[PDB]
Amino acid sequence: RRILVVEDEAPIREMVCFVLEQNGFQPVEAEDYDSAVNQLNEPWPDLILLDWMLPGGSGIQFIKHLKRESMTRDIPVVMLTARGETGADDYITKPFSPKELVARIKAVMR
Numbered sequence: 001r002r003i004l005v006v007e008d009e010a011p012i013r014e015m016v017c018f019v020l021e022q023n024g025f026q027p028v029e030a031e032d033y034d035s036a037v038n039q040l041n042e043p044w045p046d047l048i049l050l051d052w053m054l055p056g057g058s059g060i061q062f063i064k065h066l067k068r069e070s071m072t073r074d075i076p077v078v079m080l081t082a083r084g085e086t087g088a089d090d091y092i093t094k095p096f097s098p099k100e101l102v103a104r105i106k107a108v109m110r
């Protein structure tokens with residue numbers, strides 16, 4: 001079960017990848033906007049966890065890029081936001097607990 005993790009702060013991205021990994025998913029990492037776009041190919045993300053801001057582009061822009069093609073327009077998008085309208089299907093605040101993330105990712109998968 002493949003989850004694209006778009007997140008520029010490496011320890012957070014690595015934290016998120018470990019939770020998913022230990023929980024039975026196949027996580028894919030992207031450190032910035034460009035790298036995320038180049039992760040939009042076979043094999044395809046079943047859900048995207050999307051950080052709100054990245055080097056080279058925002059989460060709002062990436063969601064627009066997703067909604068522009070039929071292959072990506074349907075992929076679930078959970079926006080990762082920090083504390084302190086958008087097209088995402090759901091949102092989760094940083095820091096979040098590992099059980100919150102999994103439970104959330106599953107409620108969204110459907």
Ligand SMILES: [Mg+2]
Pocket residue numbers: 007008009051052053054
């Ligand atoms: Mg960021």
